[PDB]
Each structure stands twice: as structure tokens, then as C-alpha cells.
Amino acid sequence: MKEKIIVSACLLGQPVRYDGQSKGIVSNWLDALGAEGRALAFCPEVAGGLPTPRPPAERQGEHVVTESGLDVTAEFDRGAELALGLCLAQGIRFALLKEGSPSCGSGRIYNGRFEGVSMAGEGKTTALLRRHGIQVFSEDQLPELALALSLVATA
Ligand code: SF4
Ligand SMILES: [S]
């Protein structure tokens, strides 16, 4: 059937990023999906109770902290669980999440040293969704996500 996906709200142009900006991507496919009511916007950090703007944060293994040392893991873990809850309730098995984020990253994240250095890894929400069988794609993998969603359309 024409299934739904969960999408990082910033990729849809919502100004929920830590700096109050958006990461709206130019995509005819994603626009069409949204026009059909199939792209459910979700921001784990805002759902988890963090404000907008909010200080930058990085993973330090299981913890998520700001540069000043404030531990925000509780909010990151709440937002990841709420993303999973929305997927389970709506029967969603695919996610399109923002690359590099301590919540939404899927191929890379910042290394926890607050020095602008990236490493291979995933954000807290991506890790939880993948652990529960949900496939996560970044905005650099739109062709792959669009194909994965198109293969189950006639079922
Ligand atoms: S937590 Fe994810 S959806 Fe929310 S602004 Fe950051 S990258 Fe975008
Ligand atoms: S963010």
C-alpha cells in the first residue's frame, strides 16, 4: 500500500533546528509525498522537551551533552522513544532523518569533542529506530528511500 514515512521536521523547512534555522530540502518527490499526507514531520529534540533555540549538543557514547557540560540525554532519549511510538502507532517502517545530528544522524555525527570533527556513527533516534527494525535514510539517500517506499506500493 501507499505507506507513510517519518521525516525530521527541519528537512520539511520547519524552524526547529538548534539555531532556529531550517534544513528544508529541494525535492519534488518529498513535496509530492507531503502533498499526499504521507510524510509525518517529527523533531525528536522538540518532542523531548528542548527549546528552540538550544545549545549545540554532541553524543559522548550513551550520553548527550552541551559544550558547557549540561547533560541532555533525558530529553534526547524521550524524543527517540516518542519517534518510535509514532512509527509503531502509524505502521511506519521508513524514516528520512537529518544527517550529522546527535538525534537524527545516520551515517555521521560529531565526535563529542566540540571541535567540528565528524566521525562514523548515528544519532539517538536513528539508533533506536534501527534497533526496532525501521530503516533510516538521510537526505543524501533520497533515491534509495524513494525506491524502498515504491517497492511495497501495490501490495
Ligand atoms: S532533532 Fe532532528 S528533526 Fe529536530 S531540528 Fe535537529 S536534526 Fe532536525
Ligand atoms: S537540531
| 38, part of any domain | yes
Q: Please give the Cα distance from 110 to 143 (Å, whole number).
A: 25
To what resolution in angstroms was this structure determined?
1.3
| 67, part of any domain | yes
| 28, part of any domain | yes
Ligand 1 atom 4: residue of nearest CA: 43
| 17, part of any domain | yes
Ligand at minimal distance from the CA of 46 is 1
Q: Please give the Cα distance from 123 to 35 (Å, whole number).
A: 28
| 155, part of any domain | no
Q: What angle do CA 89, 93, 98 make, to 5 degrees?
A: 105
104 is in an annotated binding site: yes
Burial 23-46 (b: 16+ CB within 10 A, else e): bebeeeebeebbeeebbbebbbbb
Taken as a whole, the chain contains a residue count of: 155
Mutate which of 104, 122, 128, 137 for ligand 1? The one with the most ligand atoms within 8 Å of its CB, which is 104
| 79, part of any domain | yes
Residue that has been written with the C-alpha cell 531550517 in this structure: 22
Displacement of CA 120 from its chain's centroid (Å)? 16
Instruction: List all residues 6 or more positions away from 64 whose beta carbon is below 8 Å from its beta carbon.
Output: 57, 58, 71, 72, 73, 76, 102, 124
Dihedral (Cα; 110, 63, 73, 132), 10-degree rounding? 80
Pocket of ligand 1 (CB under 6 A): 8-10, 16-17, 43-45, 98, 101, 103-104
Task: Give the chain's domain count.
Answer: 1
Q: Distance between the two ends of the chain, CA-based, in angstroms?
A: 5
Find out whether 1 and 155 touch, Cβ atoms under 8 Å: yes
Q: Which structural domain range is residue 57 located in? A: 5-150
Q: What angle do CA 22, 128, 56 make, to 5 degrees?
A: 40
Instruction: List all residues 6 or more positions away from 24 whose beta carbon is below 8 Å from its beta carbon.
Output: 10, 11, 12, 13
